[PDB]
């Protein structure tokens with residue numbers, strides 16, 4: 245009924261196998277192994293007065309939405325009327341108190357030496373410092389890092405279909421908007437399954453996998469509701485979020501604000517359409533595939549994704565796209 249030491253969710257063998265896999269202003273992400281199974285560990289400092297990576301730490305009340313949303317989206321894998329495995333599984337959440345473990349600093353240093361880091365080395369925390377530690381299913385590697393690694397546009401089709409179906413199921417169940425679905429937040433992992441299964445308002449269907457399973461991650465800007473209680477991040481007074489340039493990504497923030505009149509509590513599932521447009525645009529303009537569309541059935545797939553790009557902004561939600569767009573028939 246209070247915070248635990250780091251050793252409670254990272255016992256020695258688990259800590260000794262941690263390798264850093266990513267980062268952001270929020271904190272750090274590590275991969276480790278327990279019971280022969282990889283997991284991802286997201287660690288966020290809270291409640292303290294130090295700047296961390298140049299920003300103030302969130303309070304407990306500010307981090308709660310991400311926790312709540314992570315649980316609700318994970319639970320969709322085990323539901324019936326609205327079921328999807330397209331989010332990321334959540335194994336546990338803990339509030340931990342202590343300085344940063346030396347073994348994690350070792351992992352942090354290895355990443356800095358090999359990939360380079362934009363973050364402060366997290367060695368300045370005292371023994372009273374609080375963190376949230378979220379343990380997730382390991383979802384693979386992000387779409388951005390797989391820019392030059394995918395087989396063909398047929399794989400792109402499967403990825404867009406999986407993302408649209410996931411978002412639709414979450415719309416139907418939870419009035420969900422992701423609100424930050426840039427290509428760093430789309431994970432890809434190998435699957436031996438030929439087709440993946442979802443259920444939308446009691447109607448089940450399948451999606452050819454092309455050998456990959458997609459997981460949507462990072463709920464820090466997300467919104468949902470149950471029984472009229474809305475859980476979200478109020479960015480109405482954020483300046484910086486809306487003044488980016490150099491990528492279509494930064495236009496999506498501005499376009500969301502236009503759609504919702506700067507009222508972030510409301511439900512505007514058109515934001516999911518905007519993100520899927522951004523992702524479709526990446527598929528066609530920045531992704532590069534090992535095999536180009538050199539045949540007829542493939543040249544048809546290409547034309548259909550091009551048609552999706554130029555028509556999808558005329559749909560009202562991911563649900564509308566899934567149920568009505570020709571790409572998915």
Ligand SMILES: CN1CCNC(=O)c2cccc(c2)-c2cnn3ccc(nc23)NCC1
Nearest residue numbers: 266267273284332380381382383384461462
């Ligand atoms: C820096 N990261 C962006 C912010 N992370 C999250 O919000 C987050 C949330 C839940 C799970 C994961 C990540 C997660 C699960 N498997 N995995 C594989 C690669 C990976 N992250 C993850 N790379 C780091 C990307």
Ligand code: NA
Nearest residue numbers: 329331332333
């Ligand atoms: Na999942």
